[PDB]
Amino acid sequence: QIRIGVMGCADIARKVSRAIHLAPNATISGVASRSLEKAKAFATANNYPESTKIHGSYESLLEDPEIDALYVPLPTSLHVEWAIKAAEKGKHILLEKPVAMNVTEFDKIVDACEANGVQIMDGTMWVHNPRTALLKEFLSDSERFGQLKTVQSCFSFAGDEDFLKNDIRVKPGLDGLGALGDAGWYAIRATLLANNFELPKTVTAFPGAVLNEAGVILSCGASLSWEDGRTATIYCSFLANLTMEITAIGTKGTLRVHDFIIPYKETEASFTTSTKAWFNDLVTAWVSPPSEHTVKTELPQEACMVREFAIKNNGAKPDGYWPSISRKTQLVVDAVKESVDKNYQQISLS
Amino acid sequence: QIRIGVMGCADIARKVSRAIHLAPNATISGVASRSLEKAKAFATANNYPESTKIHGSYESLLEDPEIDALYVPLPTSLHVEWAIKAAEKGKHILLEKPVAMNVTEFDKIVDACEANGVQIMDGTMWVHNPRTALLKEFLSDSERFGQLKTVQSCFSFAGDEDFLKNDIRVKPGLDGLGALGDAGWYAIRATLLANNFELPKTVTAFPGAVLNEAGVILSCGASLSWEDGRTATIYCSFLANLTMEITAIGTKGTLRVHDFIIPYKETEASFTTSTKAWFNDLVTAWVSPPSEHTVKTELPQEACMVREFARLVYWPSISRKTQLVVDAVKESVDKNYQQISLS
Q1: Domains held by chain A: number
Q2: Are residues B24 and B92 in the same domain?
Q3: Which residue of A10, A218, B164, B282 has the lowest C-beta tally within 10 Å?
């Protein structure tokens, strides 16, 4: 029933197109490019239904009164103008990660959204995966996991030379946050989720961040601190074999997932779990190796995403949880970027 | 065949006596304690053979001349004394990790081993696991794994109440490097190992280290920078559930170890591997997920350690690198998480 337009014919749109009408309370009703040509091409390539209204401009798609909500895979640096213009037409927004170039810009967006009573949500797929509920459940269990001590997350991939010269992620004027915004993002969200959405008190990047000639981050890392003795580390890179880890350790347990951003298969999600582990009397064996658990997921996680995204009929307020999680993730992103610019200085989040 | 003396009746000597036992080119010959009281009970308790020279001092055992080498499981802070003193009696030392309370001290022990022409080697067991070769080998494959970018390592376990009150690992005067010396050591070692034995250039501790009231580290972490885009992180704790990971990320592959200090079973060791990968076209799945390799270890790693030590007539070098990294880390915490240059 909920009608979605696609603002921008980027590559990530194909996967989300499929999510939109694996639906099943949401549907593709419009697509827009800067070029009618390309929007035309995109719609047929991706088998969009005949009734899909096909726009040759962003402005034009915003203006179409038979679209409830937009999906916006636009470069990061377009978000502040175009998410705002869209809020302003009563479009609800599914905004791609990272949400903006900084938290000031993202506060504008959210304001516009509140102002118009629309829902905003960000592109983060993995948090809607049923596994994620199981992850949060384990981390909340005071006997299987206990009190949290550390969480370590990372995501890296090896961009080919074409990617390193050409992709929007290496360009300061589009996706200008680089590996931090594109991959660090996810490592930050996992550490925030593990920590019951509590912000850290301080952030400090690791020496040795790689920038490209244009000053844009190819790889970097950080520790976060809650001054509790809970801490976390993030790591991300454009220059190293695909790897995507969560490792989280508490007083009574340990949690591992190795495919946390994109599962191995869409059909399943597995995570590994270990509680009060130890050695036999002689330390020649562990008494019990970690347990592996796997969950059937009939509906892919991105489909769960639009699903939950898809008030207009019952008159509720928007759910502030989403923009709120998004602001927190973007704040850590800026602390990290600002610790590097300031030469690896400890950044207070007060 | 090689005649070994246990200087000190440590609970860890119980698994090393078995190491020695099973090591075919070595034999358990002497064992001292500070009281021949417990020396006799340790020897009985641990099924010692008849001919085992039971001594009631460290000195008693340093003069026995039918002993070529000593395993030394003494608290960290006794190393500097008893290790200079075993070498002047011209005995070869299997020294327990951490090697000493700082690198100054360990250089003093190494000198005295050279001066007297003897072999020193710390008791890091795991680097003698057979797994550890095909793995140095997997990380040397500039095609299956490529150029190294980062390596993450940690070790944590959960001290109960007694441990945190009574263990020698929380006493400043005893094993006073705490978690860094007892657990960080292993992570640091994996980090040097993976990087082909090269000191990083700087070391910086993560804010939020936990110290006890005596000022002993119960948890802490750090990053190491080699300044060419290679970095590493290490983490260790006495306050969190058992966890032992190595993760190394190269240009073309990734290696993962989840046991590593102490495998799950002594009779085998596993690790996970992945090279190029990759999603399908719709990023809807992984094109080849990582894969599991197991290796049969007919002989446990502590036993392979003793065998190797039983060399007769590098290790001090690697010991020093890791001790050095330990002190860098510690100096960083004490100087408020400042970066610390390793010359």
Answers
A1: 2
A2: yes
A3: B282
Nearest to residue A202, comparing CAs of A342, A104, A77?
A342
Q: Which domain holds residue B233?
A: 129-343
Encoded tokens for A225:
């601190």
Is residue A245 within 8 Å of residue A153, measured between CB atoms?
Answer: yes
Q: Single out the residue of A285, A272, A131, A152 nearest to residue B272, CA to CA.
A: A272
Same domain, A140 and A123: no
**Chain B interface, mutation test: which of A163, A186, A284, A344, most B Cβ atoms within 10 Å?**
A284
The secondary structure of chain A, three-state, reads CEEEEEECCCCHHHHHHHHHHHCCCEEEEEEECCCHHHHHHHHHHCCCCCCCEEECCHHHHHCCCCCCEEEECCCHHHHHHHHHHHHCCCCEEEECCCCCCCHHHHHHHHHHHHHHCCCEEECCCHHHCHHHHHHHHHHHCCCCCCCEEEEEEEEEEECCHHHHHHCHHHCCCCCCCCHHHHHHHHHHHHHHHHCCCCCCCEEEECCCCEECCCCCEEEEEEEEECCCCCEEEEEEECEEEEEEEEEEEECCEEEEECECCCCCCCCEEEEEEEECCCECCCCCCECCCCEEEEEECCCCHHHHHHHHHCCCCCCCCCCCHHHHHHHHHHHHHHHHHHHHHCCCCCEECC
Determine, for residues B239 and A229 on separate chains, whether the beta-carbon distance falls below 8 Å: yes
Whether B86 and B206 map to the same domain: the answer is no
Contacts of A23 (CB under 8 A, 6+ apart): A303, A306, A307, A310
Partner-chain contact B284 A264, CB within 8 Å: no
> Are residues A5 and A29 in contact, defined by beta-carbon separation less than 8 angstroms?
yes
DSSP B253: E
**Optimal mutation site among A231, A261, A264, interface B, most CBs of chain B within 10 A:** A231
A260/A302 same-domain check: yes
Side-chain-facing half-sphere of B189: CA atoms under 13 Å: 29
CATH number of residue A61's parent domain? 3.40.50.720
Question: How far, CA to CA in Å, does A115 sit from each of A92, B25, B129?
Answer: 12, 80, 63
Cα distance between residue B168 and residue B122, in whole Å: 19
Examine the domain organization and report whether B105 and B236 are in the same domain. Answer: no
d(CA B90, nearest CA chain A) in Å: 31
What resolution in angstroms, rounded to 1 decimal? Answer: 2.5
Residue A191 and residue A275 share a domain? yes
SS3 B25: coil
Two structure tokens written together for A49:
């239904």
CA A257 to CA A40: how far, in whole Å?
A: 41
Q: Are residues A124 and A138 in the same domain?
A: no
Contact B265 A249 (CB under 8 A): no
Tell whether B83 and B213 lie within a shared domain: no
Residue B28: φ, ψ to 5°: -85, 110
Q: What technique solved it?
A: X-ray
Q: Of B229, B242, B262, which is closest to A219 when you measure between CB atoms? A: B229
Q: How far apart are CA B227 and CA A202, in angstroms?
A: 24
Q: How many CB atoms within 10 Å of residue B160?
A: 8
